[PDB]
Paper text:
TMP mediates its anti-bacterial effect by targeting bacterial dihydrofolate reductase (DHFR), a ubiquitous enzyme found in all organisms and thus also an important target for cancer and autoimmune disorders. DHFR catalyzes the reduction of 5,6-dihydrofolic acid (DHF) to 5,6,7,8-tetrahydrofolic acid (THF) by enantiospecific hydride transfer from NADPH cofactor. THF and its derivatives are essential precursors for the biosynthesis of DNA bases and amino acids.
To gain greater mechanistic insight, we next characterized the atomic structures of wild-type DHFR (DHFRWT) and mutant DHFR with an L28R replacement (DHFRL28R) using X-ray crystallography. Both DHFRWT (resolution 1.9 Å) and DHFRL28R (resolution 2.1 Å) were individually co-crystalized with the cofactor NADPH and inhibitor TMP. Distances between the amino acid residues of the enzyme and TMP (black values are for DHFRWT and magenta values are for DHFRL28R) indicated that there are only subtle differences between these two structures, particularly around the enzyme’s active site. The arginine side chain at residue 28 of DHFRL28R (purple in color) is oriented towards the tail of the TMP molecule where the 3,4,5-trimethoxy aryl ring is located. Hence, we predicted that a TMP modification with an appropriate polar group at the 3, 4, or 5 position of this aryl ring might induce additional electrostatic or hydrogen-bonding interactions and thus yield a L28R-specific drug candidate. Interestingly, unlike other mutations, the L28R mutation reduced TMP affinity while increasing DHF affinity. Our molecular dynamics simulations and biochemical measurements suggested that the L28R mutation leads to a unique and indirect resistance mechanism against TMP: increasing substrate affinity due to newly formed interactions between the mutated enzyme and p-aminobenzoyl glutamate tail of the substrate DHF. Also, in our evolution experiments, L28R was the most frequently observed mutation in the coding region of folA, with the strongest effect on TMP resistance. When we measured the in vitro affinities (Ki) of TMP and 4′-DTMP to DHFRWT and DHFRL28R using purified DHFR proteins (see “Methods” section) we observed that 4′-DTMP had nearly two-fold higher binding affinity to DHFRL28R compared to TMP at steady state, whereas the Ki values of TMP and 4′-DTMP were comparable for DHFRWT.
Numbering used by the authors: 1 to 159
Write the structure that this text describes.
């Protein structure tokens, strides 16, 4: 099983200048929950965004160029990433825009955080047909002192 987990603003925005254009600790909490003790495949742009290994997960970076951090696994292809995760129950693909593009066709599950924010963005979740997917579970949260936007955590499964 391959799964994508991603936070989407109003216009499927996921990124602005190699950062998420919002601050939702409640999202980073939901991200940690569903990825922990599973392998994560991220693109080199996302690695640099996070800027440190994600504890309690084998970290797998996609980069044509050679590695620059001895604490994480590096791979130069999609097939190498996928192989690098090994015989596991679930592979979590955690960004960014170009990695999502490549993995979404392969993906069985979506872990979507829908954020009530119309924010300028250089990077968007790839398009898809909701025809192709069926809503499994969702959870709505109001904005609060720490999370300036309302948000909905959704899970979808292929057919
Ligand atoms: N909203 C959300 O849920 C999330 C937000 N983001 C946002 O996403 C943005 C980053 O997305 P984007 O700019 O598309 O980049 P990525 O984060 O997908 O990383 C791009 C890099 O990945 C490497 N790469 C990708 N595919 C391959 C491949 N098949 N073989 C080899 N290397 C590969 C390349 O590295 P190289 O240059 O070494 O060749 C490429 O330059 C940021 O703004 C970030 O904030 C990211 C995570 C989640
Ligand atoms: C743990 O912090 C980060 C996590 C992510 C990936 C990510 C974040 N949120 C969700 N819902 N899905 C994801 N795949 C991306 C990040 O930066 C772009 C992070 O830095 C704050
Ligand atoms: Cl690419």
């Amino acid at each position: 099983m391959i799964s994508l987990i991603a936070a989407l603003a109003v216009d499927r925005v996921i990124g602005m200048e190699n950062a998420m254009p919002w601050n939702l600790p409640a999202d980073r909490a939901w991200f940690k929950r569903n990825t922990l003790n599973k392998p994560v495949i991220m693109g080199r742009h996302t690695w640099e965004s996070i800027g440190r290994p994600l504890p309690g997960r084998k970290n797998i970076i996609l980069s044509s160029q050679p590695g620059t951090d001895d604490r994480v696994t590096w791979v130069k292809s999609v097939d190498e990433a996928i192989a690098a995760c090994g015989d596991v129950p679930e592979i979590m693909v955690i960004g960014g825009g170009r990695v999502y593009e490549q993995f979404l066709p392969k993906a069985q599950k979506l872990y979507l955080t829908h954020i009530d924010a119309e924010v300028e963005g250089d990077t968007h979740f790839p398009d898809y047909e909701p025809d192709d997917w069926e809503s499994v579970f969702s959870e709505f949260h109001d904005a609060d002192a720490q999370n300036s936007h309302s948000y909905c955590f959704e899970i979808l499964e292929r057919r």
